[PDB]
Ligand binder design. Structure first.
Ligand SMILES: NS(=O)(=O)c1ccc(NC(=S)N[C@@H]2CCN(c3cccc([N+](=O)[O-])n3)C2)cc1
Ligand SMILES: [Zn+2]
Length: 258
């Protein structure tokens, strides 16, 4: 009886195995655009993905993860609110059963169709497993997806999803360039939060881009054909794998832009 997104094991239940679910810096949150503070001392984000080395794609039973070689500074995030260098380890998405929901963060209570999380860890902690134990261990770059025009840089991901339909399936996924998933602007909101799935560790500096990317109806429909279950288990579509907005508590969301 492990956590998930169903009636009996979904976000309202998590606190029973993961009591930090009710903690002081949980994610996601609503981004109230009118009460976010412009911080004119925030640095431009530096996204350095030219040397990114993607390895594989995995259906872990909660989402699909595109994994990268994080054994050297190949794909890094710097600047913005961050001190030091964070390495890209993986990206994944959260999405809805319907275009009117699927994002974890909301903007003035608006839900997008999906949300992309590019997960990075602070190199001063040596590996991802150490980093998640530290209050400054991770930087997650969050990008909203709306349904409209296709995103061409997403299509390689959409086309491989047939090979990882079920929990535990993996496929080789080399030479994927995550720069093809970024919007034009790197204007952002930032706040201190958590992982949005168990174990809900309060180790994340969230960086949420103002500008969504547009994906096609056919691209998000292909996400909804995935399964939460393993092969040979009853079929349950992988949809609505999002945690709702949590209380902001004693936090201020800062903006890089006026
Ligand atoms: N949606 S999200 O972007 O907030 C986001 C959510 C979940 C993860 N977790 C990933 S990719 N791997 C898991 C999470 C933490 N983890 C554990 C668990 C307990 C202890 C340790 N350890 O060794 O210190 N490691 C391995 C990344 C990102
Ligand atoms: Zn996520």
């Amino acid at each position: 009886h492990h956590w998930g997104y169903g009636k009996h094991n979904g976000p309202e239940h998590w606190h029973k195995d993961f009591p930090i679910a009710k903690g002081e810096r949980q994610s996601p949150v609503d981004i109230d655009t009118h009460t976010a503070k412009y911080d004119p001392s925030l640095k431009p984000l530096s996204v350095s993905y030219d040397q990114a080395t993607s390895l594989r794609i995995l259906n872990n039973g909660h989402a699909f993860n595109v994994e990268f070689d994080d054994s050297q500074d190949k794909a890094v995030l710097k600047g913005g609110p961050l001190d030091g260098t964070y390495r890209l380890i993986q990206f994944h998405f959260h999405w809805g059963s319907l275009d009117g929901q699927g994002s974890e963060h909301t903007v003035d209570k608006k839900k997008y169709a999906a949300e992309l999380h590019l997960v990075h860890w602070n190199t001063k902690y040596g590996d991802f497993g150490k980093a998640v134990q530290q209050p400054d261990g991770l930087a997650v770059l969050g990008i909203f997806l709306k349904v409209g025009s296709a995103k061409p840089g997403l299509q390689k991901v959409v086309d491989v999803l047939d090979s990882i339909k079920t929990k535990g399936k993996s496929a080789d996924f080399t030479n994927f360039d995550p720069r093809g998933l970024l919007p034009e602007s790197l204007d952002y909101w930032t706040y201190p939060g958590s992982l949005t799935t168990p174990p809900l560790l309060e180790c994340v500096t969230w960086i949420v881009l103002k500008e969504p990317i547009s994906v096609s109806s056919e691209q998000v429909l292909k996400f909804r054909k995935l399964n939460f279950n393993g092969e040979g288990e009853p079929e349950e579509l992988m949809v609505d794998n999002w945690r709702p907005a949590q209380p902001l508590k004693n936090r201020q969301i800062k903006a890089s832009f006026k």
